[PDB]
Design a protein around this motif. Structure first.
Motif, PDB file in Angstrom:
ATOM      1  N   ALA A 131     -75.101 111.423  86.997  1.00 47.84           N
ATOM      2  CA  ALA A 131     -73.926 111.436  85.537  1.00 47.84           C
ATOM      3  C   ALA A 131     -73.231 110.127  85.699  1.00 47.84           C
ATOM      4  CB  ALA A 131     -72.995 112.346  86.449  1.00 47.84           C
ATOM      5  N   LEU A 132     -73.118 109.614  86.684  1.00 51.39           N
ATOM      6  CA  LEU A 132     -71.839 108.688  86.262  1.00 51.39           C
ATOM      7  C   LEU A 132     -72.806 107.345  86.021  1.00 51.39           C
ATOM      8  CD1 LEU A 132     -70.108 108.300  90.181  1.00 51.39           C
ATOM      9  CD2 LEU A 132     -69.061 107.997  87.373  1.00 51.39           C
ATOM     10  N   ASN A 133     -73.879 107.098  86.205  1.00 48.54           N
ATOM     11  CA  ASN A 133     -75.641 105.814  86.302  1.00 48.54           C
ATOM     12  C   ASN A 133     -74.998 105.877  84.324  1.00 48.54           C
ATOM     13  OD1 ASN A 133     -75.757 104.993  88.176  1.00 48.54           O
ATOM     14  ND2 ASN A 133     -77.443 106.337  88.813  1.00 48.54           N
ATOM     15  N   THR A 134     -75.263 107.436  83.777  1.00 51.54           N
ATOM     16  CA  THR A 134     -75.536 108.192  82.703  1.00 51.54           C
ATOM     17  C   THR A 134     -74.312 107.218  82.450  1.00 51.54           C
ATOM     18  OG1 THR A 134     -76.672 110.000  83.082  1.00 51.54           O
ATOM     19  CG2 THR A 134     -76.455 109.651  80.836  1.00 51.54           C
ATOM     20  N   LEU A 135     -73.333 107.946  81.882  1.00 52.59           N
ATOM     21  CA  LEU A 135     -71.693 107.339  81.587  1.00 52.59           C
ATOM     22  C   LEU A 135     -71.987 105.890  81.368  1.00 52.59           C
ATOM     23  CD1 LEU A 135     -69.095 107.857  80.687  1.00 52.59           C
ATOM     24  CD2 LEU A 135     -68.169 107.606  83.447  1.00 52.59           C
ATOM     25  N   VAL A 136     -72.602 104.493  82.897  1.00 57.01           N
ATOM     26  CA  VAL A 136     -72.260 103.320  82.588  1.00 57.01           C
ATOM     27  C   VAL A 136     -73.663 103.010  81.616  1.00 57.01           C
ATOM     28  CG1 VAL A 136     -73.321 101.559  84.068  1.00 57.01           C
ATOM     29  CG2 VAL A 136     -71.729 103.504  85.063  1.00 57.01           C
ATOM     30  N   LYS A 137     -74.473 103.518  82.228  1.00 61.18           N
ATOM     31  CA  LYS A 137     -75.820 103.085  80.962  1.00 61.18           C
ATOM     32  C   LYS A 137     -75.706 103.562  79.426  1.00 61.18           C
ATOM     33  CE  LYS A 137     -79.970 103.870  83.387  1.00 61.18           C
ATOM     34  NZ  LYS A 137     -80.986 105.249  83.562  1.00 61.18           N
ATOM     35  N   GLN A 138     -74.458 104.257  79.208  1.00 63.82           N
ATOM     36  CA  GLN A 138     -74.191 104.725  77.551  1.00 63.82           C
ATOM     37  C   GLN A 138     -72.753 103.208  76.462  1.00 63.82           C
ATOM     38  OE1 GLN A 138     -76.441 107.031  76.823  1.00 63.82           O
ATOM     39  NE2 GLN A 138     -74.959 108.011  75.187  1.00 63.82           N
ATOM     40  N   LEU A 139     -73.000 102.843  77.829  1.00 63.66           N
ATOM     41  CA  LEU A 139     -72.504 101.411  76.979  1.00 63.66           C
ATOM     42  C   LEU A 139     -73.267 100.466  76.476  1.00 63.66           C
ATOM     43  CD1 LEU A 139     -69.246 100.833  80.300  1.00 63.66           C
ATOM     44  CD2 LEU A 139     -69.019 101.259  78.546  1.00 63.66           C
ATOM     45  N   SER A 140     -73.827 100.626  77.108  1.00 63.06           N
ATOM     46  CA  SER A 140     -75.198  99.887  76.179  1.00 63.06           C
ATOM     47  C   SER A 140     -76.055  99.618  74.925  1.00 63.06           C
ATOM     48  CB  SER A 140     -76.509  99.638  76.933  1.00 63.06           C
ATOM     49  OG  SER A 140     -75.734  98.805  78.478  1.00 63.06           O
TER      50      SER A 140
END
Lengths: 50, 49
Positions: free
Chosen positions: B16-25
């Motif tokens: 979930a955290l990795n997905t949240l971070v990736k969304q910043l791209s």
């Protein structure tokens, strides 16, 4: 060039002062898209086509 | 696999955290996902859009 056969000049590996052009009184149109004309000198590009 | 029940919790949250971070791209329709690039190129009247 004629517009049907427009001339493309590739510009690279140089310092681009866009204030010389923008602050000129000799142009009737100077419209920038995707970029502000007053921030051009703060930017770096991988290529410019004239 | 004996402790899969505990590992699954760790994996779900890490994912979930990795997905949240990736969304910043993601651009989401913007010219750039990078906020600094928008600000360096555009003035407020267009940058705000």
């Amino acid at each position: 060039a004629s517009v049907y056969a427009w001339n493309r000049k590739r510009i690279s590996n140089c310092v681009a002062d866009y204030s010389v052009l923008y602050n000129s009184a000799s142009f009737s149109t100077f419209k920038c898209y995707g970029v502000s004309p007053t921030k051009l000198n703060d930017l770096c590009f991988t290529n410019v086509y004239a | 696999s004996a402790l899969g029940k505990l590992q699954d919790v760790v994996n779900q949250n890490a994912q979930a955290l990795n997905t949240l971070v990736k969304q910043l791209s993601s651009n989401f329709g913007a010219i750039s996902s990078v906020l600094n690039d928008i600000l360096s190129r555009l003035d407020p009247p267009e940058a705000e859009v």
